[PDB]
Design a protein around this nucleic acid. Structure first.
Ligand SMILES: [Mg+2]
Ligand SMILES: [Zn+2]
Lengths: 1111, 158, 83, 39, 94, 263, 110, 14, 104
DNA sequence: CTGCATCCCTGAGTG
DNA sequence: TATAATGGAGGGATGCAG
RNA sequence: ACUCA
C-alpha cells in the first residue's frame, strides 16, 4: 500500500546506534580486539595497572588476554550458564634481591560477555546493566545555607575512591577543612604541603580580610614534619604518632593514587574550573620525600575570590548536566573488577610472607576467588543489574537506554527531593523530559534522548548544526551542556530557503532561555525535534497535541505491548518504527547483495555476491523473560533477489520491518450503555473471530529429583494410587508427552519421594486391616499444573546424573523442564492502550449485530468513551483517528513526524479524497441518501456542524471533513442522534492480563513463625488485610467480621481447623481463640527479659499457653 | 456525544488578545530600556499582563461556547460536571499559559499554543518542568498524608 | 497542656496502643518499669489480642440483647409463674 | 452517613481520623498539607 | 437495599442492636432448623432453583423478615440464658 | 532451623546471635577457671556485653554485627518487634487472611447497587467448604472427602456443582476492598452474582467511594463466615445502606460521568 | 545453611522465610479428614456387636493406644486365644461385608 | 567505642 | 477465666530461671549427619520439647498413653510438639550484663 | 548550638 | 610440642542530653 | 529494586 509522509524538516544525520551506550562502553572496557601491546590505560587494563606491581618479592603485571566463550549464547540460556570469556594474565614474580624472575600466565576465571544487542546472559537469564547518573567528580563551590555571604568549597572524587573534602570560612575567620566528619584548620595541612607565610601572603593577599584569618603563627613556626605529626594526632587520636605512620596515613588519604582517585572527568573539571593543570588524579603528591600540593591552593584561591566577589568566579549548579555524569556498563563492571583485584592483591601480599620465601611461582601467589566473587556479585546481585525486559523488542531497546539515579554509590529514595527529580534545562537533547516512571521513582529513572550519546568522560552530548552568517551548514557538533551554554542555538523548525535562514526573526535558546534573535546572531541550530525526546516518546504521532502527563503513559505503555500473532504497524507512524526494529536485532537482514537459495519455517539460506552460501537459522517459539513468544517469520521467497540491508525475516512484533506493537482497529468515539464507563472499553467479537489481539505465551515449569537421607527421589510413571486417566499423557519415564493438552490439576512430571518415617495412627492400623493393603514406601510428589494455568506441551528438557555433558548441583540426580504454551485470545479484563496515554480494560465483548455500524454495513471494532479525552488533554488520538479514517478509505498509511507532521488542512484534503470513495461509490451503485441520514443531518445543522441549505451529499461531506459520520445502532437500526467520530486507531494489548492476575484461596500454606497465610498467587497465598482494612472494618462497627479476619481466617490454628470442619459439616463456625502471633509476641518479649502477663478481672494470671510453657 | 479535533473551538478573540498583549509587552520593554522601571518591576508586569490575558481568553472560550455552541461536547461535559474544568478547556482551546522554571520562578514567555494547535518542542520542554514537579509533589505527599492518617487513627481510636 | 497528635498518642494510658504506634523500646521500657497494666479500653489493644472490639456489635450497650419468639417467651413465662 | 442521631457504639474516632485523612492527598498561594500537619 | 431497612432502623435505638438481634435470631433459626419460626407458610422466604421454589436457606433474611412482622420480642434481661436455651430445646428439639 | 524444598537449610539470625553469646560466655568461664590476667578477662567481659547487646538490640550501640561475607545486619529481637515490618504492625494490627481473593475489576452497569459480579471459579474457591457440604447434601458426592477430590481436578468438575454453588451463596454477601483504604468505604458489602470470566464486576455508583476506575485496578474479595459477620455486612456494611459521606454528610453514591451527561 | 532473613528484592519489604511453608503442622483439610475417618470408623464399628467391635478396638490400638496381643484380649474377655482370634476374624468379615455394601471407607484409602 | 582499639591500648600498657 | 487486663513488668533472674526448662550450654544446633538436634544445644529436645507429638527422641515411648513421662534413655518428655513454640531456655552468664534498653 | 535517634501510604505482581 | 617471630559521603522534622 | 493501582 501507499505510504505518505509529511513534514519539511530535513535531518542531516540519522539516529545513532541506539544501543551504543552499552556496546561501545563494554567494548572500551574489555579492549578484547586490541592486541595487548597497543591497549590504552583504560578499563580492565587500568584496573590491572592500578593493582600492580604488588610490592610487599615483587609481583608485576605484563598483559592480559581474553579467550573464546566455552559455550554459545543459546547453549548458555539452555543450560543456566553465564555467557563469558576466560581471562588470563601474564605475571612475572621478581626477587629484587636475587634478580630471579619466574614468569607464568595465571587463569583469573571468566568475565561475562555482552551480546550483540547490548545485554548479558547471567546464569541462563538475560540481564541489562542500567547506566547510573551521579554527580561528576571535581571541585564545586556552593552557597553556604546558614551564612548568606559565605560559600562552601566541595572537593569530590569518584565514588568509593576517597573522601569528600569541604573547605569553609568559619565565623571566627579561620579557614576549616572537613574530612571524614572531622574539622581542622586548613593552615595545618597547607604547612604539611610546605607552604610558608610569605607564599600564602603573596598569593592570596589580593583578597583583603581572609588571609589574616588564614594566618596562624604556631603552625608556621613548626616545620612540615611537626605539622604532619600534629595533623595525624588530630585525625587519628589515640594512635601513637610514629612519623612513618603519619606519612603513610596522610599519603593514603590525599596523595595515594590507589586509595584516592579523582575522575578523568574529575581531573578535567578541576582543571577547567580552577584554571590549572593536574599531574595526576590526586589532590597532592609525595615527591622527593615530602608532600607537594596540587589542588588545595587553587581551590582555596577560588573560594576567596568568590567570597570577595571577584568577577569571573561563579557558583556551580550541581544539577547542571555538565556537573552530572553517566557511569555506563564498562565503568561499573570495571569498578567491581578493581575491588576484586585489590582483594586478590591483599591475598598475594599475605602469601609473600608465609610459606617458603624462595620457591614461589605466580600461580602459587595468586588466588582468583576474590575477583570471580566480585564480578559474580556485580552481575548477579547488584541493583543496576536487572532482569531484562524483553516483552517486545522495544522493551529491551528502552531498558538498555535507561538512566538510574539509584543503586550503589547513588541516591536513596529519601535522599531524593525536588531538585534531583526535576527536569533541568540542560536535559534538552540529552535526557527525555517525558519518559519517566509514574509514582515514587519519578525523576529518578529517566531515558536517554534519541540523538544523545555519552562521551568518554561520561557527559551526555547532543548534536547541533553549525550556522555561519545566515547559512546552516551540514556539519554537526556534539556538545556537552557546559559548552552548549556558550552559543545561541536556533530551533529546528526555523524557516529555510536552501541552506539560508529565511526568517527575519528566529526562535533560539541562550543558556536554555528562549529568545527572539536575528539570523546574524545564530551560532547553531537544532538537528531535529526528535533529539529532545526518547525513543519511546518519538513513537507517539501528534505528540505536540498531547499533554505531557499522558504522553508519559503512552511512552511507558508501549514498553508493555505484547507481540501479537497478526501484529501490524500503525497506519499513522512517526518514521522511527523501522529503525527501532533494525537496532533491536529481533529482525533479520541480508549482509550483502545476493539471491535467496532456500526459505523454510526454520531457516533461510542466501547465496551472496561472494558466492558463499550463508544459512541463517530462525528462532521459533522461544520464551522471553516475561513469557511472551519471541519467534522469527521468513519474509522472502526462494529465488528472490535481495540487496545489502534488505529484510529477510520479521522478528516478534514487527511487520515487514516496521514496529508492530498492536493492531489498527476501526474505532468509534461515543458512550455505549455505560460499558465504557470510566475508561473501560467495548470491543467487537469480530476481533476474536479474525484473531486480532491474540498472543502466544509460554511458561516454564521445572522439577528436581534429588538424593535424600530417606532414599532417592525418582521421576517415574509409577505413581501410587493413581488411575490410568491421570497417567494418560505421560510417557514411559513419567514426563508428559509433547503436544498434550494440560489443564489445572494435570501431571506434568511424575515423581515419587520416600515417605518420611512415621507411625501410622491406630485409625490407619484399623483401616489397613480392613482393606488388607500395605501402605506404599513412596509418596506422590509429582509436579502438577497450578490453578488457572495450562496449555499445550511444546518442549521437554531432561538432565540426569551420569550422562555426558551435564552435572547438577550437589545431591540432585536429575532435573526436568516442561515448556507449556498457550494461545491467548482477548477477553474481559485484558488491558488495551494507544500511544497517547489512553488506557482501559475490556469490559464487554458484544456480538457483531449489536455493534454500531456505518451505513454500508461495516461495523466498528472498538468503542471508546469520549469522556476520557477532555480531562486528559491528549488530542493526538483524535487526529490519529481522523487521519486513520482517511487512510482507511484511501487504503494507505502515513508517516507524521514529531512536531513536524500532518496539519489540519492536509488531513481535511485526505478526508475529502476519502469521502469521494466513501460516497460516490454508493451513488454509482444506485442508492440515494437514507431517511435516517436526513434526520441526522437535520439534528447536525441544529448543532451548527453543517451549513443549512446545502444538499445532503454536501452536508455529509462537511461532516466527513470534521471526521464524523452517520452511525447506525445495530440493536435498533435507528441512527445515533448525532454525527460520531469514527476512524482507524492503533491500539496495543498490554502485558497485564486477567488470566495472570485472577486468584482466590480458601485455605492453604501458612508461614513458619507467624502461622499466617503466605502471600502471592504463586504460593497460593491469601490477601493481606492490612491496618487500613482493619480501620475500615472498625469504622463500620463490624466486630465479628474483624475478629474472623484476626483469628478464624488466619493464624488461629485451633480456630481455623474447627471452622473448616464446622463449615464442611454444615455447622456454624466456632468461637475464635488466641491468635498464634500474639503468643509469638509474648515469647519474643520474654526473650527481651520482659514479663507479659494476661490477667483476668481479679488480676490473676491467665495462661494462654495452656500449661505447655510452664513447668 | 463525541469529540473531534474541531470540537475544541479557538475563539476569534484569541488573536486580538495576543496582539494586544504583544503591543503591551513592547510598551513595557520600551519603558524598561528608558530606565523607568527595574528588572523586577518589568518581570512582574509581564507576568501580570499574561495572567490577565489568560483569564481573558478563558472567558472568551466559554462565552463563545455559551452563545454559539451551547451543545458543544467539551462545553456540555464541563457545565454538567461530567468531565473537565475551565482551565483544561482553556488549555485545549485557548492558550496553554505561563509555565514555571524548576526553581518555581515563572518564564517571561508563555506558551501561546493550545493542544488543538500543538506546542513547539521548546514549549513542550518548558512545560515538562512543571509536569515533573507536580509528579514529585504527589509522590512525596502521599507518604506524608498516610503518616498523618495513621497518627490521627492512633490518637482517636479509643 | 496542648501536645500534638504524636506525643498525645504516645502518652496514652494503654501501653499496647502506644507500643504498637511508635517508639516501641521507650514505651516498653517505661511500661515495664512502672508495671503498667493495659485495661483493654481502646480498639488497638483488643485487635492485638484478637478480641471483640468495644464498638459496634461489640459495644456493651447492645452486646447482651436477647431475642425470643412469643411462643417460647410465653412458655418460659408460664414456667416461671409456676415456681 | 444516615442524617439521623448517631447510634451508641459507633467507633467515632476512627471515622474522624479517616474523614480527615482521606482528602489529604488532594491538599495543595496556599500552605496546604504541611500547614495541616503543622496544626 | 435490604427490604424495609428503614423500618428496621426505626425499631431500635441503635443500628448495632438491630444487627445483634438479627444475628442471634438467625443463630436460633439455624440451631433449631427453622421450625421455631414465627413466619406463616406463605410468609416463608423463597429461593428459585432449577426444580422450583424452595425455602430460603439464608437465616439472616428469615430473621429480618420475622423482625419486620413484629412477632419477635427483643430486649435486655428478658430471661436467664440456660432457661431460655432449654425451654427452646423442649419446644423444638435438636 | 528448617529444611526447604530442595533440602537446603534456612535458619533465623537469632540462632547466630545466641551462638556468639554462648561461645563468648563459655570462653569467659574457661578463662576464669584457668586464671587468666585481668586484661584478657576484661576484654572477654566487654565482648560478652557487646554480644548481649547484639542479641537484644543489634546496631543500638556500636557497629551492627553481620554474618560473614555480608553487610546485612542480623535481625535482633528489637528489630523483630518494632518497625513497619515489626511484629505489631505486620502480624498483630493486620494479617493475611483465609477465604480471600483478588481480581481485576470491570464496570457492571446492569448491576443493582447492592450487587457485584463475582467470577465462578473465585466463588468456588472462596465458598469451597460450604460447597462441599452442599455437594454432600445433594447427591453430587458420597461425602466431603470425595467432593474435595472431585473439585481438585478441573476436568472432573460437572455442571451440577455450579447449581450447588448458586444454592450456597444465596442471600449471602461478600466484602470488596480496594487499596488504598482511605476511609471506611474502601470496603463495602455486595451481594455476589456469579459470572463467567475472570473479572470482578463493580457497580458504577460506588466507584467514587473506592476511587476506583477501570484502567487496570484490582480489588480484593473477602467472605464473612459466621451469621454474626454476615449480619454485620448485610446491615451495616452494605453498599446500598451507605449513601452519604460520614465526613461531610453529603451524598457519596451519586450520578457521575456518563449518567450526568445523559440526564 | 542460609539466613531466613535473606532479602528478596532491593526493597526492605520481604524476606526469604516468608516464602517457605510449614510442612509439620497439619492443614485444616488433613485434620478434618482424620476426624471424618475416626467418625466413619466408629460408624462402621457400631454395626458389629459390642464384644467383636471391642476386640478390634483393643487389637488395633484405637483404645489405650497399644495393640494388644490375642492372648491379652482373650484373657480380658475370659475366652481362649483361639476363641478371641475367631471372633476377631468374624468381626473383620462383617466389616469387609459392610464395606463392600456401603463403600464408605474407600475414599479414606488415598 | 572501638573494642579493638581499646584492647590494643590496654595491651600497650604492659 | 476471661482475660481482662495485660500487665508488663521487669523480670528477675529468678523469674527467668522459672521460665526456663533447661540451660543451653552449647552453641551447637543440629548434628551434621543425623540432622537431629544436638544435646544441650539451642534445639535440644530435652529442653524445649519433642519434635514429634507424644514421641521421645530415641523412640522408646511413642504414644499418648505416656504423657508427662520423661524417657529415662533420651531425656525427652512425651507431649505435643507445639510446646517447641512455647518453652523457654536460659543461659547462665559468668558475669552480669546490662539490658541495653535500660542503658541506651 | 551540636550530636544522636526516630518515623516518613497501601495493596498487588515478578524474581 | 622448641630458629625467631611481639599494637588492625545529595532530607528533614523533633525530641533528648551536654 | 522494577512494574501496576
Ligand atoms: Mg485507576
Ligand atoms: Zn526416649
Amino acid at each position: 500500500m501507499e505510504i505518505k509522509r509529511f513534514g519539511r524538516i530535513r535531518e542531516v544525520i540519522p539516529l545513532p546506534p541506539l544501543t551504543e551506550i552499552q556496546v561501545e562502553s563494554y567494548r572500551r572496557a574489555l579492549q578484547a580486539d586490541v592486541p595487548p601491546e597497543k591497549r590504552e590505560n583504560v578499563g580492565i587494563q587500568a584496573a590491572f595497572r592500578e593493582t600492580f606491581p604488588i610490592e610487599e618479592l615483587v609481583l608485576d603485571f605484563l598483559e592480559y588476554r581474553l579467550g573464546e566463550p566455552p559455550f554459545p549464547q543459546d547453549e548458555c540460556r539452555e543450560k543456566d550458564l553465564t555467557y563469558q570469556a576466560p581471562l588470563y594474565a601474564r605475571l612475572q614474580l621478581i626477587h629484587k634481591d636475587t634478580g630471579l624472575i619466574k614468569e607464568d600466565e595465571v587463569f583469573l576465571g571468566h568475565i561475562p560477555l555482552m551480546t550483540e544487542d547490548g545485554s548479558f546472559i547471567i546464569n541462563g537469564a538475560d540481564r541489562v546493566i542500567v547506566s547510573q547518573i551521579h554527580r561528576s567528580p571535581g571541585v564545586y563551590f556552593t552557597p553556604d545555607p546558614a551564612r548568606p555571604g559565605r560559600y562552601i568549597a566541595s572537593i569530590i572524587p569518584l565514588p568509593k575512591r576517597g573522601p569528600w573534602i569541604d573547605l569553609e570560612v568559619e565565623p571566627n575567620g579561620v579557614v576549616s577543612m572537613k574530612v571524614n566528619k572531622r574539622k581542622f584548620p586548613l593552615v595545618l595541612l597547607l604547612r604539611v604541603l610546605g607552604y610558608d607565610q610569605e607564599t600564602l601572603a603573596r598569593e592570596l593577599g589580593a583578597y583583603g580580610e581572609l588571609v589574616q584569618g588564614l594566618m596562624d603563627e604556631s603552625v608556621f613556626a613548626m616545620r612540615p614534619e611537626e605539622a604532619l605529626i600534629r595533623l595525624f594526632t588530630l585525625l587519628r587520636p589515640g594512635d601513637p604518632p610514629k612519623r612513618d605512620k603519619a606519612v603513610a596515613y596522610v599519603y593514603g588519604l590525599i596523595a595515594d593514587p590507589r586509595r584516592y582517585d579523582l575522575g578523568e572527568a574529575g581531573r578535567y573539571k578541576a582543571e577547567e574550573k580552577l584554571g590549572i593543570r593536574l599531574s595526576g588524579r590526586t589532590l597532592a603528591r609525595f615527591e622527593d620525600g615530602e608532600f607537594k600540593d596540587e589542588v588545595f591552593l587553587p581551590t582555596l584561591r577560588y573560594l576567596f575570590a568568590l567570597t570577595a566577589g571577584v568577577p569571573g568566579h561563579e557558583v556551580d549548579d550541581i544539577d547542571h548536566l555538565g556537573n552530572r555524569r553517566i557511569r555506563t556498563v564498562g565503568e561499573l563492571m570495571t569498578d567491581q573488577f578493581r575491588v576484586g583485584l585489590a582483594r586478590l592483591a591483599r591475598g598475594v601480599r599475605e602469601r609473600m610472607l608465609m610459606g617458603s620465601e624462595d620457591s614461589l611461582t605466580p600461580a602459587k601467589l595468586v588466588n582468583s576467588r576474590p575477583l570471580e566473587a566480585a564480578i559474580r556479585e556485580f552481575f548477579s546481585r547488584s541493583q543496576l543489574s536487572q532482569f531484562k525486559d524483553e516483552t517486545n523488542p522495544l522493551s529491551s531497546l528502552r531498558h538498555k537506554r535507561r538512566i538510574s539515579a539509584l543503586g550503589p554509590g547513588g541516591l536513596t529514595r529519601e535522599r531524593a527531593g525536588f531538585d534531583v527529580r526535576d527536569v533541568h534545562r540542560t536535559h534538552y537533547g540529552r535526557i527525555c523530559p517525558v519518559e519517566t516512571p509514574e509514582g515514587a521513582n519519578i525523576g529518578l529513572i529517566t531515558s536517554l534522548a534519541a540523538y544523545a550519546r555519552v562521551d568518554e568522560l561520561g557527559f551526555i552530548r547532543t548534536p547541533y548544526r553549525r550556522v555561519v552568517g545566515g547559512v546552516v551548514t551540514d556539519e554537526v557538533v556534539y556538545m556537552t551542556a557546559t559548552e552548549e551554554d556558550r552559543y545561541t542555538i536556533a530551533q529546528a523548525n526555523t524557516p529555510l530557503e536552501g541552506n539560508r535562514i529565511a526568517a527575519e526573526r528566529v526562535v533560539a535558546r541562550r543558556k536554555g532561555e528562549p529568545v527572539i534573535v536575528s539570523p546574524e546572531e545564530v551560532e547553531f541550530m537544532d538537528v531535529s525535534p526528535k533529539q529532545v525526546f526518547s525513543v519511546n516518546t518519538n513513537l507517539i504521532p501528534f505528540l505536540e497535541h498531547d499533554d505531557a502527563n499522558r504522553a508519559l503513559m503512552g511512552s511507558n505503555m508501549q514498553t508493555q505491548a505484547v507481540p501479537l500473532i497478526r501484529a501490524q504497524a500503525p497506519v499513522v507512524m512517526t518514521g522511527l518504527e523501522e529503525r527501532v526494529v533494525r537496532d533491536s536485532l529481533a529482525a533479520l537482514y541480508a549482509e550483502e547483495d545476493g539471491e535467496v537459495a532456500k526459505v523454510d519455517g526454520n531457516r533461510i539460506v542466501v547465496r551472496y555476491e561472494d558466492g558463499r552460501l550463508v544459512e541463517y537459522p530462525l528462532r521459533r517459539f522461544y520464551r522471553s523473560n516475561q513469557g511472551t513468544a519471541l519467534d522469527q517469520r521468513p519474509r522472502v521467497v526462494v529465488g528472490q533477489r535481495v540487496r545489502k540491508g534488505d529484510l529477510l525475516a520479521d522478528g516478534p512484533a514487527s511487520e515487514n520491518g516496521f514496529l508492530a506493537l498492536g493492531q489498527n482497529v476501526l474505532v468509534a468515539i461515543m458512550p455505549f450503555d455505560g460499558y465504557n464507563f470510566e475508561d473501560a472499553i467495548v470491543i467487537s467479537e469480530e476481533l476474536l473471530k479474525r484473531d486480532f489481539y491474540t498472543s502466544i505465551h509460554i511458561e516454564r515449569y521445572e522439577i528436581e529429583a534429588r538424593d535424600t537421607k530417606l532414599g532417592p527421589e525418582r521421576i517415574t510413571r509409577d505413581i501410587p494410587h493413581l488411575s490410568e486417566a491421570a497417567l494418560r499423557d505421560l510417557d514411559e519415564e513419567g514426563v508428559v508427552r509433547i503436544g498434550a493438552e494440560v489443564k489445572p490439576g494435570d501431571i506434568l512430571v511424575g515423581r515419587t519421594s520416600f515417605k518420611g518415617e512415621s507411625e501410622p495412627t491406630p485409625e490407619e492400623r484399623l483401616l489397613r486391616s480392613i482393606f488388607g493393603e500395605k501402605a506404599r514406601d513412596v509418596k506422590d510428589t509429582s509436579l502438577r499444573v497450578p490453578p488457572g494455568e495450562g496449555g499445550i506441551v511444546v518442549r521437554t528438557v531432561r538432565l540426569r546424573r551420569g550422562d555426558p555433558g551435564v552435572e547438577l548441583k550437589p545431591g540432585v540426580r536429575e532435573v526436568v523442564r516442561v515448556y507449556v504454551a498457550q494461545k491467548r485470545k482477548l477477553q474481559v479484563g485484558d488491558k488495551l492502550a494507544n500511544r497517547h496515554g489512553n488506557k482501559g480494560v475490556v469490559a464487554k465483548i458484544l456480538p457483531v449485530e449489536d455493534m454500531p455500524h456505518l451505513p454500508d454495513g461495516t461495523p466498528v471494532d472498538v468503542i471508546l468513551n469520549p469522556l476520557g479525552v477532555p480531562s486528559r488533554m491528549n488530542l493526538g488520538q483524535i487526529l490519529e483517528t481522523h487521519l486513520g479514517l482517511a487512510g482507511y478509505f484511501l487504503g494507505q498509511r502515513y508517516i507524521s513526524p514529531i512536531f513536524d507532521g500532518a496539519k489540519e488542512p492536509e488531513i481535511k484534503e485526505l478526508l475529502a479524497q476519502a469521502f469521494e470513495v466513501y460516497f460516490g461509490k454508493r451513488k454509482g451503485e444506485g442508492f440515494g441518501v437514507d431517511k435516517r441520514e436526513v434526520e441526522v443531518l437535520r439534528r447536525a445543522e441544529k448543532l451548527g456542524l453543517v451549513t443549512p441549505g446545502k444538499t445532503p451529499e454536501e452536508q455529509l461531506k462537511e461532516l466527513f471533513l470534521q471526521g464524523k459520520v452517520v452511525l447506525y445502532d445495530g440493536r435498533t437500526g435507528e441512527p445515533i442522534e448525532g454525527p460520531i467520530v469514527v476512524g482507524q486507531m492503533f491500539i496495543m494489548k498490554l502485558y497485564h492480563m486477567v488470566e495472570d492476575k485472577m486468584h482466590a484461596r480458601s485455605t492453604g500454606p501458612y508461614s513458619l513463625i507467624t502461622q499466617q497465610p503466605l502471600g502471592g498467587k504463586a504460593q497460593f497465598g491469601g490477601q493481606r488485610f492490612g491496618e487500613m482494612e482493619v480501620w475500615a472494618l472498625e469504622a463500620y462497627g463490624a466486630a465479628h467480621t474483624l475478629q474472623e479476619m484476626l483469628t478464624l481466617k488466619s493464624d488461629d490454628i485451633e480456630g481455623r481447623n474447627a471452622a473448616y470442619e464446622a463449615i464442611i459439616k454444615g455447622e456454624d463456625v466456632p468461637e475464635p481463640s488466641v491468635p498464634e502471633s500474639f503468643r509469638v509476641l509474648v515469647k519474643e518479649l520474654q526473650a527481651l527479659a520482659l514479663d507479659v502477663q494476661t490477667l483476668d478481672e481479679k488480676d490473676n494470671p491467665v495462661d494462654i499457653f495452656e500449661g505447655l510453657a510452664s513447668k | 456525544i463525541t469529540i473531534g479535533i474541531d470540537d475544541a473551538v479557538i475563539p476569534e478573540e484569541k488573536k486580538q488578545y495576543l496582539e494586544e498583549a504583544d503591543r503591551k509587552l513592547l510598551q513595557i520593554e520600551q519603558a524598561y530600556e528608558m530606565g523607568f522601571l527595574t528588572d523586577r518591576e518589568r518581570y512582574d508586569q509581564i507576568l501580570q499582563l499574561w495572567t490577565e490575558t489568560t483569564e481573558k481568553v478563558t472567558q472568551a472560550v466559554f462565552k463563545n461556547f455559551e452563545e454559539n455552541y451551547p451543545f458543544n461536547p467539551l462545553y456540555v461535559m464541563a457545565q454538567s460536571g461530567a468531565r473537565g474544568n475551565p482551565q483544561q478547556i482553556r488549555q485545549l482551546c485557548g492558550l496553554r499559559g505561563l509555565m514555571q522554571k524548576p526553581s518555581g520562578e515563572t518564564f517571561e514567555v508563555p506558551v501561546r499554543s493550545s493542544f488543538r494547535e500543538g506546542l513547539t518542542v521548546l514549549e513542550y520542554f518548558i512545560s515538562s518542568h512543571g509536569a515533573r514537579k507536580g509528579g514529585a509533589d504527589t509522590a512525596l505527599r502521599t507518604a506524608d498524608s498516610g503518616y498523618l492518617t495513621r497518627k490521627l487513627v492512633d490518637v482517636t481510636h479509643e | 497542656l496542648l501536645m500534638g497528635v504524636t506525643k498525645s498518642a504516645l502518652s496514652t494510658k494503654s501501653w499496647l496502643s502506644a507500643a504498637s504506634f511508635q517508639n516501641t523500646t521507650h514505651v516498653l521500657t517505661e511500661a515495664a518499669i512502672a508495671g503498667k497494666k493495659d485495661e483493654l479500653i481502646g480498639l488497638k489493644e483488643n485487635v492485638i489480642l484478637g478480641r471483640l472490639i468495644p464498638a459496634g456489635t461489640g459495644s456493651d450497650f447492645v452486646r447482651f440483647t436477647q431475642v425470643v419468639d412469643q411462643k417460647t417467651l410465653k412458655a418460659i413465662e408460664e414456667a416461671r409463674k409456676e415456681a | 452517613s444516615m442524617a439521623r442521631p448517631v447510634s451508641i457504639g459507633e467507633a467515632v474516632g476512627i471515622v474522624a481520623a479517616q474523614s480527615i485523612g482521606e482528602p489529604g492527598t488532594q491538599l495543595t498561594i496556599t500552605q496546604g498539607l504541611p500547614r495541616v500537619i503543622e496544626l | 437495599a435490604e427490604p424495609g431497612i428503614d423500618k428496621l432502623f426505626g425499631m431500635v435505638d441503635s443500628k448495632y442492636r438491630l444487627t445483634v438481634v438479627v444475628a442471634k435470631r438467625a443463630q436460633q433459626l439455624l440451631r433449631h432448623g427453622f421450625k421455631n419460626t414465627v413466619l406463616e407458610p406463605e410468609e416463608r422466604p423463597k429461593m428459585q432453583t432449577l426444580e422450583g421454589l424452595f425455602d430460603d436457606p439464608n437465616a439472616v433474611t428469615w430473621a429480618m423478615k420475622e423482625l419486620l412482622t413484629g412477632r419477635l420480642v427483643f430486649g435486655e434481661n428478658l430471661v436467664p440464658e440456660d432457661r431460655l436455651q432449654k425451654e427452646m430445646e423442649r419446644l423444638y428439639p435438636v | 532451623m528448617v529444611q526447604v524444598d530442595g533440602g537446603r537449610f534456612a535458619t533465623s539470625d537469632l540462632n547466630d546471635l545466641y551462638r556468639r553469646l554462648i561461645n563468648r560466655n563459655n570462653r569467659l568461664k574457661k578463662l576464669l577457671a584457668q586464671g587468666a590476667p585481668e586484661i584478657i578477662i576484661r576484654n572477654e567481659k566487654r565482648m560478652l556485653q557487646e554480644a548481649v547487646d547484639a542479641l537484644l538490640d543489634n546496631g543500638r550501640r556500636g557497629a551492627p554485627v553481620t554474618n560473614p561475607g555480608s553487610d546485612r545486619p542480623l535481625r535482633s529481637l528489637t528489630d523483630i518487634l518494632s518497625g513497619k515490618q515489626g511484629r505489631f504492625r505486620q502480624n498483630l494490627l493486620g494479617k493475611r487472611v483465609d477465604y480471600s481473593g483478588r481480581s481485576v475489576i470491570v464496570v457492571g452497569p446492569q448491576l443493582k447497587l447492592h450487587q457485584c459480579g463475582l467470577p465462578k471459579r473465585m466463588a468456588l474457591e472462596l465458598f469451597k467448604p460450604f460447597l462441599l457440604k452442599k455437594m454432600e447434601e445433594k447427591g453430587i458426592a458420597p461425602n466431603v472427602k470425595a467432593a474435595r477430590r472431585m473439585l481438585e481436578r478441573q476436568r472432573d468438575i460437572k455442571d451440577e456443582v455450579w447449581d450447588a454453588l448458586e444454592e450456597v451463596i444465596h442471600g449471602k454477601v461478600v466484602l470488596l476492598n480496594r487499596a488504598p483504604t482511605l476511609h471506611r468505604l474502601g470496603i463495602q458489602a455486595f451481594q455476589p452474582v456469579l459470572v463467567e470470566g475472570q473479572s470482578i464486576q463493580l457497580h458504577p455508583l460506588v466507584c467514587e467511594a473506592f476511587n476506583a476506575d477501570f484502567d487496570g485496578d484490582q480489588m480484593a474479595v473477602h467472605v464473612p463466615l459466621s451469621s454474626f459477620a454476615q449480619a454485620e455486612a448485610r446491615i451495616q456494611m452494605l453498599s446500598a445502606h451507605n449513601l452519604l459521606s460520614p465526613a461531610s454528610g453529603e451524598p457519596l453514591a451519586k450520578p457521575s460521568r456518563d449518567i450526568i451527561l445523559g440526564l | 545453611p542460609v539466613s531466613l532473613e535473606t532479602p528478596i528484592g532491593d526493597e526492605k519489604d520481604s524476606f526469604y522465610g516468608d516464602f517457605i511453608p510449614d510442612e509439620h503442622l497439619p492443614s485444616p483439610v488433613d485434620a478434618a479428614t482424620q476426624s471424618l475417618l475416626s467418625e466413619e470408623l466408629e460408624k462402621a464399628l457400631s454395626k458389629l456387636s459390642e464384644r467383636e467391635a471391642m476386640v478390634l478396638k483393643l487389637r488395633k490400638g484405637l483404645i489405650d493406644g497399644r495393640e494388644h496381643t490375642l492372648e491379652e484380649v482373650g484373657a480380658f474377655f475370659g475366652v481362649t486365644r483361639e476363641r478371641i482370634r475367631q471372633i476377631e476374624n468374624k468381626a473383620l468379615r462383617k466389616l469387609k461385608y459392610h464395606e463392600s455394601r456401603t463403600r464408605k471407607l474407600r475414599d479414606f484409602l488415598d | 567505642s572501638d573494642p579493638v582499639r581499646q584492647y590494643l591500648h590496654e595491651i600497650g600498657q604492659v | 477465666k476471661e482475660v481482662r487486663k495485660v500487665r508488663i513488668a521487669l523480670a528477675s533472674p529468678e523469674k527467668i530461671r522459672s521460665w526456663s526448662y533447661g540451660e543451653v550450654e552449647k552453641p551447637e544446633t543440629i548434628n551434621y549427619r543425623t540432622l537431629k538436634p544436638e544435646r544441650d544445644g539451642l534445639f535440644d529436645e530435652r529442653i524445649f520439647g519433642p519434635i514429634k507429638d507424644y514421641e521421645c527422641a530415641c523412640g522408646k515411648y511413642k504414644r499418648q498413653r505416656f504423657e508427662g513421662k520423661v524417657c529415662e534413655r533420651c531425656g525427652v518428655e512425651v507431649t505435643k510438639s507445639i510446646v517447641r513454640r512455647y518453652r523457654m531456655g536460659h543461659i547462665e552468664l559468668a558475669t552480669p550484663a546490662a539490658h541495653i534498653w535500660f542503658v541506651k
